[PDB]
Amino acid sequence: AFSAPAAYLTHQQKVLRLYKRALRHLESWCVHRDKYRYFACLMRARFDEHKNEKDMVKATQLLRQAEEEFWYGQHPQPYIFPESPGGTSYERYECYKVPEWCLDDWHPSEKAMYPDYFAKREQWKRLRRESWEREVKQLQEETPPGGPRTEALPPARKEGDLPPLWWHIVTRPRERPM
Amino acid sequence: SFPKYKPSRLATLPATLDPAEYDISPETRKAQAERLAIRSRLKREYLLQYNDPNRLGVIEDPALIRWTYARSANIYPNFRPTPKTSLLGALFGIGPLFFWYYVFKTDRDKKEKLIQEGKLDQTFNISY
Amino acid sequence: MLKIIIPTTMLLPMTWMSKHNMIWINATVHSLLISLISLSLLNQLGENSLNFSLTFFSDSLSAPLLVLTTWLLPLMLMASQSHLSKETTTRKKLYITMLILLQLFLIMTFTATELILFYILFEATLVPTLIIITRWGNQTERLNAGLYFLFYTLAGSLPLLVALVYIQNTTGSLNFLIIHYWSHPLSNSWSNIFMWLACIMAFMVKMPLYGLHLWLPKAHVEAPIAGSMVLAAVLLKLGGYGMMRITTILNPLTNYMAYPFLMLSMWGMIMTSSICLRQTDLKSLIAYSSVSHMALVIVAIMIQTPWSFMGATALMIAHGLTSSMLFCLANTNYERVHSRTMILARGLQTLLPLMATWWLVASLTNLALPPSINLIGELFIITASFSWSNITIILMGMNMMITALYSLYMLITTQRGKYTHHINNIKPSFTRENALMALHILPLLLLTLNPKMILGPLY
Amino acid sequence: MNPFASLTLTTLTILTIPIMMSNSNIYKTNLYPNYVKTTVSYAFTLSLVPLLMFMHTGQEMIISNWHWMTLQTVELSLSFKMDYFSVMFIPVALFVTWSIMEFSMWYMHSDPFINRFFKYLLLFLITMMILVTANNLFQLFIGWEGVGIMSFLLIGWWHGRTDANTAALQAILYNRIGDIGFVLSMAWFLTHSNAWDLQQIFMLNNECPNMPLIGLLLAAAGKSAQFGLHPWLPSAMEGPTPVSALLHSSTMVVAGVFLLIRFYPLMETNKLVQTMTLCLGAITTLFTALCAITQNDIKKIVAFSTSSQLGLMMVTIGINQPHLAFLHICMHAFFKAMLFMCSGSIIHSLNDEQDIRKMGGLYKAMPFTTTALIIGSLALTGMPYLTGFYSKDLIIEAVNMSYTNAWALLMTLIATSLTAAYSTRIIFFAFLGKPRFPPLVLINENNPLLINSIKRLLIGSIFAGFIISNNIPPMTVPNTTMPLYMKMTALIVTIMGFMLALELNNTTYYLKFKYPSQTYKFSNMLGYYPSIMHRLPTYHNLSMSQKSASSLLDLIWLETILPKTTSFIQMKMSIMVSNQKGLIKLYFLSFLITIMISMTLFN
Amino acid sequence: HVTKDMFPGPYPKTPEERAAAAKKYNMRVEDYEPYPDDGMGYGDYPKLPDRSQQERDPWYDWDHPDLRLNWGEPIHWDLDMYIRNRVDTSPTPVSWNTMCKHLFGFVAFMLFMFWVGEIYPSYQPVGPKQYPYNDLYLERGGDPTKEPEPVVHYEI
Numbered sequence A: 001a002f003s004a005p006a007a008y009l010t011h012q013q014k015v016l017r018l019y020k021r022a023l024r025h026l027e028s029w030c031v032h033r034d035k036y037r038y039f040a041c042l043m044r045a046r047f048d049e050h051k052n053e054k055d056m057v058k059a060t061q062l063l064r065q066a067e068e069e070f071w072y073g074q075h076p077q078p079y080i081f082p083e084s085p086g087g088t089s090y091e092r093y094e095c096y097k098v099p100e101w102c103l104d105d106w107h108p109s110e111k112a113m114y115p116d117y118f119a120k121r122e123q124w125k126r127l128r129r130e131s132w133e134r135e136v137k138q139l140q141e142e143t144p145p146g147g148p149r150t151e152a153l154p155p156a157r158k159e160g161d162l163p164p165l166w167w168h169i170v171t172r173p174r175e176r177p178m
Numbered sequence B: 001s002f003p004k005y006k007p008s009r010l011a012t013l014p015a016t017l018d019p020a021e022y023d024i025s026p027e028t029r030k031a032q033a034e035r036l037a038i039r040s041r042l043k044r045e046y047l048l049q050y051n052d053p054n055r056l057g058v059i060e061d062p063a064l065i066r067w068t069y070a071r072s073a074n075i076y077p078n079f080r081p082t083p084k085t086s087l088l089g090a091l092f093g094i095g096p097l098f099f100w101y102y103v104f105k106t107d108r109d110k111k112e113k114l115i116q117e118g119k120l121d122q123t124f125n126i127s128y
Numbered sequence C: 001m002l003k004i005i006i007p008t009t010m011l012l013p014m015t016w017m018s019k020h021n022m023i024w025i026n027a028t029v030h031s032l033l034i035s036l037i038s039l040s041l042l043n044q045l046g047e048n049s050l051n052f053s054l055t056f057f058s059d060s061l062s063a064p065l066l067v068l069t070t071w072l073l074p075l076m077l078m079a080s081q082s083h084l085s086k087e088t089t090t091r092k093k094l095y096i097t098m099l100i101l102l103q104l105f106l107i108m109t110f111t112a113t114e115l116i117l118f119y120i121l122f123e124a125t126l127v128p129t130l131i132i133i134t135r136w137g138n139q140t141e142r143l144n145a146g147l148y149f150l151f152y153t154l155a156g157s158l159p160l161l162v163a164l165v166y167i168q169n170t171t172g173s174l175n176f177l178i179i180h181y182w183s184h185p186l187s188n189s190w191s192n193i194f195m196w197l198a199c200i201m202a203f204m205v206k207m208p209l210y211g212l213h214l215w216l217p218k219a220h221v222e223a224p225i226a227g228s229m230v231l232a233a234v235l236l237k238l239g240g241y242g243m244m245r246i247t248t249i250l251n252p253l254t255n256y257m258a259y260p261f262l263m264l265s266m267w268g269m270i271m272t273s274s275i276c277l278r279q280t281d282l283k284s285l286i287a288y289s290s291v292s293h294m295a296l297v298i299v300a301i302m303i304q305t306p307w308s309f310m311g312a313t314a315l316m317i318a319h320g321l322t323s324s325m326l327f328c329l330a331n332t333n334y335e336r337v338h339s340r341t342m343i344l345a346r347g348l349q350t351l352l353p354l355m356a357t358w359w360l361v362a363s364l365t366n367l368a369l370p371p372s373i374n375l376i377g378e379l380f381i382i383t384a385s386f387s388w389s390n391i392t393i394i395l396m397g398m399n400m401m402i403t404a405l406y407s408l409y410m411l412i413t414t415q416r417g418k419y420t421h422h423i424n425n426i427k428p429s430f431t432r433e434n435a436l437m438a439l440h441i442l443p444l445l446l447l448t449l450n451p452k453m454i455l456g457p458l459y
Numbered sequence D: 001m002n003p004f005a006s007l008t009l010t011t012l013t014i015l016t017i018p019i020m021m022s023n024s025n026i027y028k029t030n031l032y033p034n035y036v037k038t039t040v041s042y043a044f045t046l047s048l049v050p051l052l053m054f055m056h057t058g059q060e061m062i063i064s065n066w067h068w069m070t071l072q073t074v075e076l077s078l079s080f081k082m083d084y085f086s087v088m089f090i091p092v093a094l095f096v097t098w099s100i101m102e103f104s105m106w107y108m109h110s111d112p113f114i115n116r117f118f119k120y121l122l123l124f125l126i127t128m129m130i131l132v133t134a135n136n137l138f139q140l141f142i143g144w145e146g147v148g149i150m151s152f153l154l155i156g157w158w159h160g161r162t163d164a165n166t167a168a169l170q171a172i173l174y175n176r177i178g179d180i181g182f183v184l185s186m187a188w189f190l191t192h193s194n195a196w197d198l199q200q201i202f203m204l205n206n207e208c209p210n211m212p213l214i215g216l217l218l219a220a221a222g223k224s225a226q227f228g229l230h231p232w233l234p235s236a237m238e239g240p241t242p243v244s245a246l247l248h249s250s251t252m253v254v255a256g257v258f259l260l261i262r263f264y265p266l267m268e269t270n271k272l273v274q275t276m277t278l279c280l281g282a283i284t285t286l287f288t289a290l291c292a293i294t295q296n297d298i299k300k301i302v303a304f305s306t307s308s309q310l311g312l313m314m315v316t317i318g319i320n321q322p323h324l325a326f327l328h329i330c331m332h333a334f335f336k337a338m339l340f341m342c343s344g345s346i347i348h349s350l351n352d353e354q355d356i357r358k359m360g361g362l363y364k365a366m367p368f369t370t371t372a373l374i375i376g377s378l379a380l381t382g383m384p385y386l387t388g389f390y391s392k393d394l395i396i397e398a399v400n401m402s403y404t405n406a407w408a409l410l411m412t413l414i415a416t417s418l419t420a421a422y423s424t425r426i427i428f429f430a431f432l433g434k435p436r437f438p439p440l441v442l443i444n445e446n447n448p449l450l451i452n453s454i455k456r457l458l459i460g461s462i463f464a465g466f467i468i469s470n471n472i473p474p475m476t477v478p479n480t481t482m483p484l485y486m487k488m489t490a491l492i493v494t495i496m497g498f499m500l501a502l503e504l505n506n507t508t509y510y511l512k513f514k515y516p517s518q519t520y521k522f523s524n525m526l527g528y529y530p531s532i533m534h535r536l537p538t539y540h541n542l543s544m545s546q547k548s549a550s551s552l553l554d555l556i557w558l559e560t561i562l563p564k565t566t567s568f569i570q571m572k573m574s575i576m577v578s579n580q581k582g583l584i585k586l587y588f589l590s591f592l593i594t595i596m597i598s599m600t601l602f603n
Numbered sequence E: 001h002v003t004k005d006m007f008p009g010p011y012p013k014t015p016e017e018r019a020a021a022a023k024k025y026n027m028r029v030e031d032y033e034p035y036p037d038d039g040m041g042y043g044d045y046p047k048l049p050d051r052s053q054q055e056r057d058p059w060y061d062w063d064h065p066d067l068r069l070n071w072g073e074p075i076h077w078d079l080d081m082y083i084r085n086r087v088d089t090s091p092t093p094v095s096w097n098t099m100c101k102h103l104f105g106f107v108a109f110m111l112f113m114f115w116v117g118e119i120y121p122s123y124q125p126v127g128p129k130q131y132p133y134n135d136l137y138l139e140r141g142g143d144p145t146k147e148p149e150p151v152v153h154y155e156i
């Protein structure tokens, strides 16, 4: 989520992803903890037998019959964490997320309440106003010619500088605002 | 060996079952690299226009404008009368009308014949 | 009847002699006062009519339409106050003049004892609407939309003038009372068939009948908010009123003549309801929903039974109010976003809760939730069509289900989900917009308490 | 004078005061939920009196107080029917709603919009009371649509979640499919009987034809989620647990069965509609139990249990036993509401975790919920002398000794066995094994609201069956003499279900693993009905709506026919007419040609 | 702010205008593919894969997390058909054809069994129920001025 994606997945990453998926679905099949531990150790033993294989062709031929075997026995109703993209509470609290700029439209009678919070907000606004002008030139000078090759951003390198494009990452509403 | 999964239109093929991803060539890697390059350029432009404190409006999206324009206003100038278009238009615009006309005409002729013959038993039928 | 007409005429000098910063207030106040005067007309008798003079009469079919027409003008002024802020005083006065002239033409049209006067005013309404659409329109397709709107109507209504002059030459009168009392059957003849077509097509094209409805999406999408309000609320009902007035001389020819139009409307309600499911524009979706409702009204008028007529009147009033409210909500969104696309601004319930409540109530009323008058008309027409033929129930049910589907689709797409991140100019809703929605919605729920006021002369 | 009518109208009227005060100051404070709960409890204790009067005498009344409108010979007025069904169902519904609201005061404590949530619950209750006591078809339609709209609003409570909106729209779609048949029935009754009033319909229909009863059956199947229109009810679990406990468990979903009960005088005079009702109920109960047997979400399991119970209710309707179906409705209300309460308590105590694979030993860790759920499961399985006994046992006995289908009876018996089986599944996977929840234990029951709300329905699910069965007058001929094996058949199949389910569940401890079979995959994906019938029809309608209705016809061919053709022809004629070089040679040559023609063609 | 040349146009027939259209829609030329040049007015618009939006990556940081779209990316012609609120094309553990066969087979079997049960009912070894007064003639319909044919019941 936070990390920028790569142009492709290597063989090692794909093997790790299959290992994680197979372990999760085996846990879903084996409800009890001792049975899951036994079958997960057996799965690891079956999994690391071809660890030391060297040539690329047989390695690519493997993991493929493995994916087919996984798909045949994939437990059509796996366990999902409640906050996961398939969980029972994936986007439960997304209706309580209000943007930060909404506070700029509050009535002065409303802004009379919470004066310290709005003073701090104004300080943050000033900081952002200066930091953006620094960041535009910093990113212009740091970017390779012809456009970026990946969606990864550089950190700040000077003393008073802030990381480029930081305002909408730092000022996330919350995980559970209400 | 295990039973094979057969994809369909509404149940597509899984990504991990694509033989294409296993056929790796330098051209494929270069294509993926330039795909992510253009994606990163678009993301950079969007974030640059998004994090700007000066902007106080809607970021215009040319892709959305093109989508709406193609869906609504670009249809007729690209229309060409062909046997396919003519036949489909005639069917989908004339067939239902005549089908429903036949159905309702037959039903009403039957009802009128029964009324004239008097065997319909319309007792208590006051509001129409 | 002049106690309504004269103040509407005096609205013009009052507007043109007003101060540069007092046109809206005076126009709104006096329009509301005129509307109060119009309320007296609702009292109606079970007997013939309210025959004021040789020129004008009132009826329980014309009274609700007149009340709605008089009530709509203050709402149109309230809606137009916003986007005309940077306009010169003379042009704002011209806009108000166009609205007043349109109201006057509609008021004189709905009384209209004589049919040629009805035709003259029914055509006089065409000019102010055209000027409003093609002058104060935002896009460049407003010219083509106005051309479509003008030429469809004129091509439909030119044979009607010939039919009317022929009818007066033969019968000797076009006064509606004499026409009703001296009615004679039409023999099944080719000349009578073409006379029926010339009498019917002018009102069919303005309903709009399916297949002749092309002008409506263009005109509604390209018009300013006030133009869309009036077109959806009153101008569509002119065809229904004309058909109800003119089907008295078309008997018994109507029994078999109606089939082509009945089939077209019954299939076209399904077609337009399905079209509403795949639409990227709010205004186009609302326009196609209007087309479906008016097609069902066409079915009701063609069936020609007392329940059909009562349901058609109730549905006309309810649809006018609901479509006006929906267009106003869409305009409130547009004036913030300037896009007029459904998928751009999302999750507005989080930012604007009361406007989301207005959206929900408008969608529920369009969905024909009981005991709203929308469902009263819908159910009366459905029962009459079932008595006409038991097989209509399939099409009616399909239309109801698809209607609920796209109404809730429109509600969910715009009000629910996650807000668009890059849109940050969504200011709190003004008191003007909230009052506009309230004045749209409260009359509906008050009218559902006295449904006999909108059930027409056959109640 | 005759306090029956005054009290029955007073209950419904006082149920609406908090709705009027929703714009007052109390709505902006944190005392609003307690206010609404107190109002509901007062309404229940007030409505307990007309039921007592009916129990003493049998009082029956019709109240047509306000006359709304009259169309010709048809008169429509606000009329309330206060018969056995109304005066018996109102106290039960009010009791369940009071318990659920006291539970919600605890469950929804951290939700910012709780006053709104409480207000919505009150709105739903008001609509359901309108539905139950309606005397004509228009008022009952008003309630029919009101409960559906409240269901739509409460399912999509978390409107930021896409799946909640999808489930709400699904419920609306299926309910509209039922509304089609409802409207058909209304049209038929108005056309033929000249009334929507129930009394006139009962007089003028001695041999009711097939069409109105088929429309009523379609509406009942739509709202009670029968096999054709079932999937919306399990998807309605997206909403908060109190919503699933009140609406989609015991009060709203019995509306179709109640509609078929209300029209029972016409139902008994038709034999084909009764057959269709029986077959629909049997297939629904079997299919829903088979779906339930293998689910992992507890709420999904209990929802499929509710659907199977509704199928059994409609089987009872099909065998011409309406009062028994009403009694089963009343009993199922109690025990299914308590089952959802226990499930919600478990879910809250485990950090909003619903899957049963991640809940282990809760028999000792939280015992009050354990005993309440055990009693509810026993009640659900028709344990002798328990709330479920006095309805389910009679259902089985009546189906066993009636001239009905053999297949329907077999399906009902298998459904009873599967009911025992998934009750065993719930208990085994939720209370018996070793704990499987995350290490940070936050288990807590010590809250008076939850305990009191659960224990009230516990006392109900223990004693209400006996009390109600012994207090109501007889309404059907009893099955006095029976074969001994036919008398024990319900108990035999239920005990077989316990034993087989327990034996098959005990094998999960063994250290062996095998891939699933085809039957398990069929049962787990709910017979693949949701996948096929939510991907094929929707796609085919939307694709047509875009390609043919929208583009091909409207934007292309209708545009080609009148306007484009007219423009093209007029432009071509204009080009032909105006393309003149300005040479008087050709002009006067044409004049000469024209002059000659006039002389020789017009005379 | 969008210019005239940035709007969709007619079907491309030359490779140069094919590349121009591919550049306009912000994609590679090798990845660009228009709809077939049939009568329908697709014109110059990419024929994106018919994959649904539900099966896009839920972990990528989309500019529109709900719709799972990125700003500036080409939009599928049928986007409003696949919005995670409508028809989706996510692969299923069981194949479409097998699912159809199993679902259809179960329904056909249930219907045929119900018909068989109609043909072969179930009942008890008893005679018809007996009602005293001429099969309750007066209380069922009435008609007291016809004197129906009396029916009398057999005591055993």
Ligand SMILES: CCCCCCCCCCCCCCCCCC(=O)OC[C@H](COP(=O)([O-])OCC(O)COP(=O)([O-])OC[C@@H](COC(=O)CCCCCCCCCCCCCCCCC)OC(=O)CCCCCCCCCCCCCCCCC)OC(=O)CCCCCCCCCCCCCCCCC
Binding pocket: D293, D294, D413, D414, D417, D418, D421, D425, D493, D496, D497, D500, D501, D504, D514, D515, D516, D517, D518, D519, D520, D521, D523, E105, E106, E108, E109
């Ligand atoms: C008249 C004499 C009266 C006395 C009768 C005799 C007394 C009883 C005799 C016993 C008879 C069988 C009872 C055992 C039930 C089976 C249990 C079992 O072995 O399951 C494991 C086994 C596979 O499990 P697995 O793959 O390893 O799952 C992995 C873990 O176990 C995953 O485990 P998990 O933890 O995820 O969940 C566990 C769950 C998961 O287990 C399952 O997967 C459930 C699937 C099997 C249960 C379904 C049985 C209900 C039958 C209704 C079918 C109606 C017809 C449908 C037609 C379909 C049309 C295609 O299992 C359970 O919870 C318990 C299952 C039910 C046992 C408790 C109740 C059984 C008693 C009621 C049945 C009969 C008594 C009626 C009482 C009234 C007296 C007449 O399931 C099977 O192999 C199915 C066995 C029978 C299925 C027959 C249907 C085959 C149809 C194929 C096509 C045929 C041609 C059609 C042509 C059509 C042309 C149009």
Ligand SMILES: CCCCCCCCCCCCCCCCC[C@@H](O)O[C@H](CO[C@H](O)CCCCCCCCCCCCCCC)COP(=O)(O)OCC[N+](C)(C)C
Binding pocket: C188, C189, C190, C193, C210, C211, C212, C260, C261, D561
């Ligand atoms: C395009 C989008 C929709 C626009 C609106 C469309 C609605 C207009 C359709 C007009 C309705 C029908 C017109 C005439 C109906 C009369 C019934 C007649 O047609 O049926 C038979 C008539 O037979 C034949 O049809 C003769 C007419 C054949 C010539 C007509 C052309 C057919 C297709 C034309 C459609 C074009 C419509 C659009 C024009 C631009 C009956 O046989 P017959 O007993 O002898 O005649 C009875 C009448 N009598 C008693 C007066 C003699």
Ligand SMILES: CCCCCCCC/C=C\CCCCCCCC(=O)O[C@H](COC(=O)CCCCCCC/C=C/CCCCCCCC)COP(=O)(O)OCCN
Binding pocket: C152, C155, C156, C159, C162, C163, C166, C190, C191, C192, C194, C195, C196, C197, C198, C201, C205, C212
């Ligand atoms: C949206 C566009 C729709 C445009 C309107 C389409 C229909 C137009 C109606 C037909 C046009 C002529 C109307 C007839 C005027 C009424 C006069 C009348 O009825 O008298 C008839 C006159 O009848 C006619 O003359 C009709 C001749 C038709 C000529 C004009 C043809 C115009 C197009 C006709 C076909 C299309 C009509 C339907 C269009 C469908 C919608 C597009 C009898 O005349 P007499 O000789 O005095 O009496 C006979 C005994 N001696």
